[PDB]
Design a protein around this nucleic acid. Structure first.
Ligand SMILES: [Mg+2]
Ligand SMILES: [Mg+2]
Ligand SMILES: [Mg+2]
Ligand SMILES: [Mg+2]
Ligand SMILES: [Mg+2]
Ligand SMILES: [Mg+2]
Ligand SMILES: [Mg+2]
Ligand SMILES: [Mg+2]
Ligand SMILES: [Mg+2]
Ligand SMILES: [Mg+2]
Ligand SMILES: [Mg+2]
Lengths: 139, 211, 192, 117, 176, 43, 97
RNA sequence: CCUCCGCAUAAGCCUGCGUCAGAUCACUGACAAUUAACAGCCCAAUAUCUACAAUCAACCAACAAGUCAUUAUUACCCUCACUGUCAACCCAACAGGCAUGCUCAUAAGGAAAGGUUAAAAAAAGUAAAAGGAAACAUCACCUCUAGCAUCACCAGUAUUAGAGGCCAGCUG
RNA sequence: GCUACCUAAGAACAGAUUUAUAGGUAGAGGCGACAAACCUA
RNA sequence: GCUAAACCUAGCCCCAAACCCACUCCACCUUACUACCAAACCUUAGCCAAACCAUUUACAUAAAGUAUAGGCGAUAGAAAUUGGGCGCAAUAGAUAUAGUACCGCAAGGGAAAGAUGAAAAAUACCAAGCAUAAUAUAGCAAGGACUA
């Protein structure tokens, strides 16, 4: 869990166990070309590599084999109207290599107007032969 | 741009995510996108019942008299440019189509006596009554300019006008207002214009030719 | 939303609002009078009657209540006319848009008399508070299906009292139910 | 030369960047030769149940009624949890009923906590 | 598997998904602790689903199908976590009588102000903790002047706010 | 004008919160920044 | 051009307000209510200038000794500097002596 | 055609010529990236050991005298986490500066000329008849002070320490 | 964080050298192969 | 006719009254914002006035500027006793839209600015400066004038 005080372990003590997990996770699409067995996540900052291994093993039954993380610096270079820097938040990225010869490809997610569109078909733009004269009149 | 697809594709290429938000108020329209049944000119007592069950004091034998006064008085509101009466007299599908191109020029329409009696032709039908009327009148026009020089029509001389005017009523406080004006495909061309027109050909970039 | 944000006909976070109220404007705030929450008596859907301006006397229906400016949008009344859908070379369409109304300019309507009546909040034996008119003791009531998807609990399973109130932790109860048995005893640390 | 920016781990010389980290928790400790020993017991085990046959979906149908918020005070939890056992054993040593004076012998101590969340 | 990060493959691109209500608290106070454990993991996996769907929604430059059910799932995780904390707190009041799960003490730092100090776990006792004894939980007498200065800055801000509220009230009585 | 020749060790060791709190005069520096209202009391 | 183009909103002045219609009442509470109160006990204001008129140096001296112990810290400091300035001004500077 | 530049690490900076879009001698918004083996981040006590420079270390050759080490007993069995990783970049100037390793003209990096004319004056470069200038410190020395030990002098002891003084030739 | 001297542990090409890094000395002061120089224009 | 102009209302000031604040979770004196190992008090000085300076030099009412002190000079000076707005209204009023931007190694210094309407789900005329409209012998550029 995150934003929780962990209890201190003394040598010979019990197993540290988390029962309700605080931190979420989201698997993003890779922005570059990556191997077929690598799944890229956005871990939250406090989640270690080992927590991510047991997180996907326990909750999702994913056979995880390697995990490699990079912390991404979001830019502090964009300002308000007040000339005050906005920070896009930093985030950790997990790169997960799945075991047993399995392979993940990111799926193809995302594969009254009658009145408007039925007057956009009855537009009847002005004739050039009419020379600017309004054609409402029956004369 | 030219349509909504161009703006949404440009907003997707740019990154403008416009979330479609849920609002309890919508647009309370009082008109129709065009005509219910296109009366093509040379048994609809169903819709007369479907009008009298809402209105219940409605004589068709008096209505083309009323349709005359809805017509003529609305056209006199062009002689003064009185738009606030036109919104009582004309629908909102009909208001721009008669007042937009006439802006920044003076018109001097006038009515003189009808050749025929005006007579109702058909009647059709949250509920929109729609009554097409045949009028065979004699009218006078003079459309001037910003500069006050005549660009359409002799002012004295009356001309004989056929008018298949479609009226519409909302079916609480509304009334019969001019909705459209059918012009038949057999109709003769209108008055010619006092000026001459050049109509351009294809503007050729150097890589293409005229053929 | 910033301080002295100006409310308007648009909702407070839409695209048209962010065109109208960008985060750097500062305008003269509208002096609205204080109407308490107990004392607001126009609800979405009430048939009302307009007292001032155009469409005076006409009886419409409240569609939106913009409560921060003491506003009532009587749907179909107090209309001006705006175009919509205006492209580069099409003039759009003429549409009857509605300008709002202050709550002073609007009175409610008896459903048996159809008259502009003052409304006082009397109390009742059946309901603690409800509106009652003045020209008659008449209760004007507050005005105004579903199939479950694959990821909704039905009302049966959502309301089963499966909770036996005990003196155990969620942690201890899950340790018992999951069959986890912990032999190592916890060793006392210092807190300071 | 910045003061407004947050002092993060990306920012110092090598000796600074190695020490400061993100909010991650220590799992083991360093030993000689800079060899990290990982302790199995400090790593959290996600105790995750079996979801088979489980009838609670993430949303509630709209047909369910509205109820009133009654937060669980200790008077309520004493009443339903303890009060029938005291009414039964009074019509016919408080540790009998689910009370513990100390909890230094206890695994999940309530003050101060040793469980997580 | 990883297909639990994605919803039903029939819903892909439908731009509107019928979702039910959120869990309110009183619906969840009827559920046992084992059942709130399991519902925590149901909502947990659903929340990871919706967060992948947001980030792919920003990636493809498209709007979300229905962003409301993310608000509902955060709503339910908040209500469920609040219920579980209520039962931990009521059991803590019965078994020990404390109110904070974590110990602390009202202390008074170098800067003179009174702060709730949250205790940390340590192994060695405090008197031979070398880093704990470099912290000063006492204010020397050169601080009490700044305490008076801070006191008066807060009293100025409060007086300005109260007076300004009365001026707005006078403008309301002149206008109405 | 290249008088500022930067390093982070000299910046934190010169002007950081720990050196500011190490002396009574530096604690008064912090208290005056806290009373002027500033966003950065130190490096 | 620092002059306004539209003439301002009108100044509605109610001469028969509560305050204006009852202005001046109990100014003669001494001389025709048996001298039980003085009219200076009718004025409301700062506690150091209820029924006292002085120039600025005297208002500052009297403010310091009558309320100065519970003045704010930098207001008391500004006021001691004002008495120190106004002392050095009235006593050492001027035309007539 | 230049290349006295480059490429990496260090320090610094902190997303700052990635893609999509748009406004603007001719930055804004969205999205994506930097993946640890390199480098940081180390070490169980208590005692006790550590006379023989480096220089191809061999002779030689020295003085200014030097950069590198354990053992005894006790305790000790888990293991690969965390952080850095991008760029056309930093400090200045509105010229300059910058540690180190390699490459020593480059396999790497770049462009002195917006277009024209070919005035003066100015700057720089090349050519030019005949002539060919038309005080302190301090070795050394002297003087004075100082017989002494755990924060300088000094882990030194009067051979010490401190303070003083001293023509021919060429050339715009 | 310049600059002056110093210290620690370095480096480079021949030293009364040059230099990177971190530390020390602070204004009645410091520091000075003493220019009554320099000590963030 | 461009540039611009205008605009009231954010807020503020002075009183009165009243004695204020401060643990969602986490982190925060180590290089603050970092889960976890062997000691506090010690006369203010001076500026300035004395036309220099050197002792000296202010920090309810009434007695009373009295007694006193004092290079008996500048000056200082008791006691007994007595008993909401004839505010500001965007160069103002707060520095404040913010202790932010920016500047500084740091202590520290410290900005500027907004104005539609009931609804935006309705998109005039006036500063200097120019432009319309360059110039005509001669001269503090005007005055007397003059048909000009
Ligand atoms: Mg890494
Ligand atoms: Mg390594
Ligand atoms: Mg690199
Ligand atoms: Mg190249
Ligand atoms: Mg050129
Ligand atoms: Mg020559
Ligand atoms: Mg003097
Ligand atoms: Mg007295
Ligand atoms: Mg101001
Ligand atoms: Mg200001
Ligand atoms: Mg002008």
């Amino acid at each position: 869990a995150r934003n929780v005080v962990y209890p201190l372990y003394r040598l010979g003590g019990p197993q540290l166990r988390v029962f309700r997990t605080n931190f979420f996770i989201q698997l993003v699409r890779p922005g570059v070309a990556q191997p077929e067995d690598t799944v890229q996540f956005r871990i939250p900052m406090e989640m270690t590599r080992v927590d991510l291994r047991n997180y996907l093993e326990g909750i999702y039954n994913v056979p995880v084999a390697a995990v490699r993380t990079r912390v991404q610096h979001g830019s502090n270079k964009r300002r308000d109207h007040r000339n005050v820097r906005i920070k896009k938040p930093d985030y950790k990225v997990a790169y997960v290599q799945l075991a047993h010869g399995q392979t993940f490809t990111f799926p193809d997610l995302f594969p009254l107007y009658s009145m408007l569109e039925e007057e956009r078909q009855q537009r009847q733009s002005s004739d050039p032969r009419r020379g600017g004269v309004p054609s409402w009149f029956g004369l | 741009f030219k349509t909504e697809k161009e703006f949404m594709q440009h907003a997707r290429k740019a990154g403008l995510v416009i979330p479609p938000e849920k609002s309890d108020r919508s647009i309370h329209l009082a008109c129709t996108a065009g005509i219910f049944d296109a009366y093509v000119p040379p048994a609809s007592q169903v819709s007369i019942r479907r009008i009298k069950d809402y209105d219940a004091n409605f004589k068709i034998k008096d209505f083309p008299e009323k349709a005359k006064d809805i017509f003529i008085e609305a056209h006199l509101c062009l002689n003064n440019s009185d738009h606030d009466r036109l919104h009582t007299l004309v629908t909102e599908h009909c208001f721009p189509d008669m007042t937009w191109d006439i802006k920044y020029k003076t018109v001097r329409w006038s009515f003189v006596e009808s050749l025929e009696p005006s007579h109702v032709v058909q009647v059709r039908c949250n509920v929109y009554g729609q009554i097409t009327v045949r009028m065979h009148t004699r009218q006078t026009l003079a459309i001037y300019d910003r500069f006050g020089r005549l660009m359409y029509g002799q002012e004295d001389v009356p001309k004989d006008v056929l008018e298949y005017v479609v009226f519409e009523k909302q079916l609480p406080y509304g009334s019969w207002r001019m909705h459209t004006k059918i012009v038949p495909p057999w109709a003769p061309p209108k008055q010619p214009i006092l000026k001459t027109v050049m109509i351009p050909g294809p503007q050729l970039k150097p890589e293409e030719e005229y053929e | 939303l910033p301080p002295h944000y100006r409310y308007g006909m648009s909702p407070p976070g839409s695209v048209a609002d962010k065109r109208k109220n960008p985060p750097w404007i500062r305008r003269r705030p509208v002096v609205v009078e204080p109407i308490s929450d107990e004392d607001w008596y126009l609800f979405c859907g009430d048939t009302v009657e307009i007292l001032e301006g155009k469409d005076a006397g006409k009886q419409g229906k409240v569609v939106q209540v913009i409560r921060q400016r003491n506003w009532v949008v009587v749907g179909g009344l107090n209309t001006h006319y705006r175009y919509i859908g205006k492209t580069m070379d099409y003039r759009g369409t003429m549409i009857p848009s509605e300008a709002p109304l202050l709550h002073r300019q609007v009175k409610l309507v008896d459903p048996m008399d159809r008259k502009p009546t003052e409304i006082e909040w009397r109390f009742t034996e059946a309901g603690e508070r409800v509106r009652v008119s003045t020209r008659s003791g008449r209760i004007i009531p507050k005005p105004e299906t579903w199939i479950d998807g694959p990821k909704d609990t039905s009302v049966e399973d959502a309301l089963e009292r499966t909770y036996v109130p005990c003196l155990k932790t969620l942690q201890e109860e899950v340790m018992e139910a999951m069959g986890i048995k912990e032999t190592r005893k916890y060793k006392k640390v210092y807190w300071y | 030369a910045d003061r407004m920016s947050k002092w993060t781990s990306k920012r110092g010389p090598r000796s600074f960047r190695g020490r400061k980290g993100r909010g991650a928790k220590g799992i083991g400790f360093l030993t000689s030769g800079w060899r990290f020993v990982q302790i199995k017991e400090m790593v959290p085990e996600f105790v995750v149940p079996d979801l088979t046959g489980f009838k609670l979906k993430p949303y509630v149908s709209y047909l369910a009624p509205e109820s009133e918020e009654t937060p669980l005070t200790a008077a309520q939890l004493f009443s339903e949890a303890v009060a029938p056992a005291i009414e039964k054993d009074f019509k016919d040593n408080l540790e009998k009923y689910g009370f513990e004076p100390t909890q230094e012998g206890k695994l999940f101590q309530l003050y101060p906590r040793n469980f997580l969340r | 598997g990883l297909e639990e990060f994605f919803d039903d493959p029939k819903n892909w691109g439908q731009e509107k998904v019928k979702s039910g209500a959120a869990w309110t608290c009183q619906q969840l106070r009827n559920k046992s602790n084992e059942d709130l454990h399991k519902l925590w993991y149901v909502l947990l996996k659903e929340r990871n689903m919706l967060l992948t769907l947001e980030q792919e929604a920003k990636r493809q430059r498209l709007p979300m199908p229905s962003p409301e059910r993310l608000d509902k799932v955060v709503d339910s995780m908040d209500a469920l976590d609040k219920v579980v904390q209520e039962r931990e707190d009521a059991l803590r009041l019965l078994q020990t009588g404390q109110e904070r799960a974590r110990p602390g003490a009202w202390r008074r730092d170098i800067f003179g102000r009174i702060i709730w100090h949250k205790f940390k776990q340590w192994v060695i006792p405090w008197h031979l903790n070398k880093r704990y004894n470099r912290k000063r939980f006492f204010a020397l007498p050169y601080v009490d002047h700044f305490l008076r200065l801070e006191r008066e800055k807060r009293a100025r801000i409060k007086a300005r706010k109260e007076n300004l509220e009365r001026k707005k009230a006078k403008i309301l009585l002149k206008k109405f | 004008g290249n008088e500022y020749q930067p390093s982070n060790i000299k910046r934190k060791n010169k002007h950081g919160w720990v050196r500011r709190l190490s002396t009574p005069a530096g604690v008064q520096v912090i208290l005056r920044r806290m009373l002027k209202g500033r966003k950065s009391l130190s490096h | 051009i620092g002059i306004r183009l539209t003439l301002p909103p009108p100044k509605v002045v109610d001469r028969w307000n509560e305050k204006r219609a009852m202005f001046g009442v109990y100014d003669n509470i001494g001389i025709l209510g048996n001298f039980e109160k003085h009219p200076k006990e009718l004025i409301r204001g700062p506690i150091w200038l209820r029924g006292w008129k002085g120039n600025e140096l005297q208002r500052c001296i009297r403010k310091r000794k009558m309320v100065g112990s519970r003045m704010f810290a930098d207001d008391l400091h500004n006021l001691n500097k004002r008495i120190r300035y106004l002392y050095k001004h009235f006593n050492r500077h001027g035309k007539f002596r």
